[PDB]
Design an enzyme around this catalytic site. Structure first.
Site, short mmCIF file in Angstrom:
data_model
loop_
_atom_site.label_atom_id
_atom_site.label_comp_id
_atom_site.label_asym_id
_atom_site.label_seq_id
_atom_site.Cartn_x
_atom_site.Cartn_y
_atom_site.Cartn_z
N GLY A 13 61.77 -9.71 4.80
CA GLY A 13 63.05 -10.30 4.99
C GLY A 13 62.98 -11.77 5.38
O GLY A 13 61.92 -12.30 5.73
N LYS A 14 64.14 -12.40 5.31
CA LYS A 14 64.31 -13.82 5.56
C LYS A 14 65.67 -14.00 6.26
O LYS A 14 66.65 -13.32 5.91
CB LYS A 14 64.31 -14.55 4.22
CG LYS A 14 64.02 -16.00 4.35
CD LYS A 14 64.38 -16.79 3.11
CE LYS A 14 64.63 -18.24 3.52
NZ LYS A 14 63.87 -18.60 4.77
N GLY A 15 65.74 -14.87 7.26
CA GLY A 15 67.02 -15.04 7.97
C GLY A 15 66.94 -15.82 9.26
O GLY A 15 66.09 -16.71 9.41
N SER A 16 67.81 -15.48 10.21
CA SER A 16 67.87 -16.15 11.52
C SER A 16 66.57 -15.99 12.32
O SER A 16 66.32 -16.74 13.26
CB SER A 16 69.05 -15.63 12.34
OG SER A 16 69.04 -14.20 12.42
N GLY A 18 63.64 -16.23 10.77
CA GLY A 18 62.64 -16.92 9.96
C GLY A 18 62.27 -16.11 8.74
O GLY A 18 63.14 -15.67 8.00
N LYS A 19 60.98 -15.91 8.53
CA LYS A 19 60.46 -15.07 7.45
C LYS A 19 59.50 -14.04 8.04
O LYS A 19 58.67 -14.36 8.89
CB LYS A 19 59.69 -15.93 6.41
CG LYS A 19 60.53 -16.63 5.34
CD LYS A 19 59.60 -17.28 4.30
CE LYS A 19 60.34 -18.14 3.26
NZ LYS A 19 59.35 -18.86 2.35
N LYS A 35 55.77 -12.66 11.37
CA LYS A 35 56.85 -13.61 11.44
C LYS A 35 56.24 -14.99 11.31
O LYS A 35 55.32 -15.34 12.05
CB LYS A 35 57.60 -13.48 12.76
CG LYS A 35 58.70 -14.54 13.02
CD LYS A 35 59.16 -14.48 14.48
CE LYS A 35 59.98 -15.69 14.88
NZ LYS A 35 61.41 -15.47 14.64
N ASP A 130 71.22 -9.67 21.99
CA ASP A 130 71.41 -9.43 20.55
C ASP A 130 71.34 -7.95 20.19
O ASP A 130 70.94 -7.58 19.08
CB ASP A 130 70.39 -10.24 19.73
CG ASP A 130 70.82 -10.42 18.26
OD1 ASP A 130 72.03 -10.22 17.94
OD2 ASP A 130 69.93 -10.74 17.43
N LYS A 132 72.15 -4.60 18.75
CA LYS A 132 72.87 -4.20 17.57
C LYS A 132 72.05 -3.19 16.75
O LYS A 132 70.81 -3.22 16.83
CB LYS A 132 73.28 -5.42 16.72
CG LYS A 132 72.16 -6.24 16.16
CD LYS A 132 72.72 -7.29 15.26
CE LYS A 132 71.66 -8.24 14.80
NZ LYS A 132 72.20 -9.13 13.74
N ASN A 135 68.89 -4.17 14.86
CA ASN A 135 67.71 -4.52 15.64
C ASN A 135 66.95 -3.34 16.23
O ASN A 135 65.96 -3.51 16.95
CB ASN A 135 68.07 -5.52 16.73
CG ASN A 135 68.27 -6.93 16.20
OD1 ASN A 135 68.08 -7.19 15.03
ND2 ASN A 135 68.63 -7.84 17.08
C1 LIG Z 1 66.41 -6.90 8.98
N1 LIG Z 1 66.54 -5.86 10.07
C2 LIG Z 1 67.39 -4.70 9.69
C3 LIG Z 1 65.22 -5.53 10.68
C4 LIG Z 1 64.79 -6.35 11.94
C5 LIG Z 1 65.14 -7.87 11.94
C6 LIG Z 1 64.53 -8.59 13.17
N2 LIG Z 1 63.07 -8.36 13.21
C7 LIG Z 1 62.49 -7.26 12.78
C8 LIG Z 1 63.26 -6.11 12.19
C9 LIG Z 1 61.15 -7.35 12.92
C10 LIG Z 1 60.05 -6.40 12.60
C11 LIG Z 1 58.95 -6.04 13.53
O1 LIG Z 1 58.82 -6.45 14.69
N3 LIG Z 1 58.10 -5.18 12.94
C12 LIG Z 1 58.54 -4.97 11.69
O2 LIG Z 1 58.01 -4.25 10.86
C13 LIG Z 1 59.76 -5.76 11.43
C14 LIG Z 1 60.49 -5.67 10.15
C15 LIG Z 1 60.55 -4.55 9.38
N4 LIG Z 1 61.30 -4.77 8.32
C16 LIG Z 1 61.59 -3.82 7.26
C17 LIG Z 1 61.79 -6.04 8.34
C18 LIG Z 1 62.64 -6.65 7.41
C19 LIG Z 1 63.02 -7.98 7.65
C20 LIG Z 1 62.56 -8.67 8.79
C21 LIG Z 1 61.72 -8.05 9.71
C22 LIG Z 1 61.33 -6.71 9.47
C23 LIG Z 1 60.89 -8.69 13.55
C24 LIG Z 1 59.74 -9.39 13.95
C25 LIG Z 1 59.93 -10.66 14.50
C26 LIG Z 1 61.22 -11.22 14.63
C27 LIG Z 1 62.37 -10.52 14.23
C28 LIG Z 1 62.17 -9.24 13.68
#
Ligand SMILES: CN(C)C[C@@H]1CC[N+]2=C(C1)/C(=C1/C(=O)NC(=O)/C1=C1\C=[N+](C)c3ccccc31)c1ccccc12
Length: 326
Positions: A13-16, A18-19, A35, A130, A132, A135
């Site tokens: 994923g990509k967003g608030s 980062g990546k 991240k 945050d 929700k 998360n």
């Molecule tokens: C996008 N949302 C529904 C979530 C949270 C979105 C927030 N988030 C997830 C979460 C997240 C994780 C994580 O700690 N371990 C993960 O496998 C992970 C995932 C898995 N997946 C599949 C994923 C998609 C987009 C972004 C991040 C992630 C993460 C790491 C650092 C900063 C923010 C996040």
């Protein structure tokens, strides 16, 4: 370490935040989520202190089972990297879309683990801000993992208060909307919103635009359906108190609420309680349980503003590095 020690397979994923990439340690064939942040983008966005708070909070997270674990933190000239636990079991928002709402015992179990995760963060002086359904991730056994620590406040012991307008619209506390100084009370309001959605499958407050929604949060009484379990309504009624110092979680003892009558809190924190549900996951590459939006994008770090990188102060991200014991 070195990002070359990893093969970046997918952009999750990509967003608030980062990546975030699906990454394999070359070398050992262990999978992680990574991240990645661009340092120039962080400086443009004015988010240097945000980045450091997230790293410091993630530094504590290995101490609790219901928070996403961080293994290590390292930086390059252009890049910041956080190496995390990989969770492809899906988030609660994604899972609730399929079934509409969770059954009472399932919602009760998630609520209880979230309580343990939040109370752990508050004991360390962290307001999360945050909370929700997006998360909250599931591990492979179906226990929860609170993810994304990018909105936390860090020095909130005892009488300490803060002022920032932070949150996600449906979940934001009325005291934030009224511009008041606030503490961990805001987390217990968001908890109520999240519980409400799990049980009912709708948000408690409504509006055609952000402004009308903010008015709803400040003014309206949430709807409680005829069939809703008495103790579940009662808990919601107690969290949706608009005076923060009179809200359950701030006052009283939320663990003692009759909704959680049958929860052994000690066993739950040791993960000795059977989760109500377990995600189906065939491999690290199985993406059946999450949003597929970014999965066909090349798993690339994009280009930075070389001019800003070579001219910026280099010591802004010092004390960024960290290694989780072993
Ligand atoms: C996008 N949302 C529904 C979530 C949270 C979105 C927030 N988030 C997830 C979460 C997240 C994780 C994580 O700690 N371990 C993960 O496998 C992970 C995932 C898995 N997946 C599949 C994923 C998609 C987009 C972004 C991040 C992630 C993460 C790491 C650092 C900063 C923010 C996040």
């Amino acid at each position: 370490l070195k990002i070359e020690d990893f093969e970046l397979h997918k952009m999750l994923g990509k967003g608030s935040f980062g990546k975030v990439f699906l990454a394999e340690f070359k070398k050992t064939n262990q999978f992680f989520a990574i991240k990645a942040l661009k340092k120039d983008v962080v400086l443009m966005d004015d988010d240097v202190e945000c980045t450091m708070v997230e790293k410091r909070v993630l530094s504590l997270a290995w101490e609790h089972p219901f928070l996403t674990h961080m293994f290590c933190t390292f930086q390059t000239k252009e890049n910041l990297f956080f190496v995390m636990e990989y969770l492809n079991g899906g988030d609660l928002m994604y899972h609730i879309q399929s079934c509409h709402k969770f059954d009472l015992s399932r919602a009760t179990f998630y609520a209880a683990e979230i309580i343990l995760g939040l109370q752990f963060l508050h004991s360390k002086g962290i307001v999360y801000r945050d909370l929700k359904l997006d998360n909250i991730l599931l591990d492979k056994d179906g226990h929860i993992k609170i993810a994304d620590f990018g909105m936390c406040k860090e020095n909130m012991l005892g009488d300490a208060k803060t002022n920032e307008f932070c949150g996600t619209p449906d979940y934001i506390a009325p005291e934030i909307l009224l511009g008041q100084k606030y503490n961990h009370s805001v987390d217990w309001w968001s908890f109520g919103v999240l519980l409400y959605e799990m049980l009912i499958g709708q948000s408690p407050f409504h509006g055609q635009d952000e402004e009308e929604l903010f008015h709803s949060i400040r003014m309206d009484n949430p709807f409680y359906p005829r069939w809703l379990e008495k103790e579940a309504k009662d808990l919601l009624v107690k969290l949706f108190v608009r005076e923060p110092e009179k809200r359950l979680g701030v006052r009283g003892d939320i663990r003692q609420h009759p909704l959680f009558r049958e929860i052994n809190w000690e066993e739950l924190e040791r993960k000795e309680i059977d989760p109500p549900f377990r995600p189906k996951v065939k491999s690290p590459f199985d993406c059946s349980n999450f949003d597929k939006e970014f999965l066909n994008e090349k798993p690339r770090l994009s280009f930075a503003d070389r001019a800003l990188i070579n001219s910026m102060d280099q010591n802004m991200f010092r004390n960024f590095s960290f290694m989780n014991p072993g």
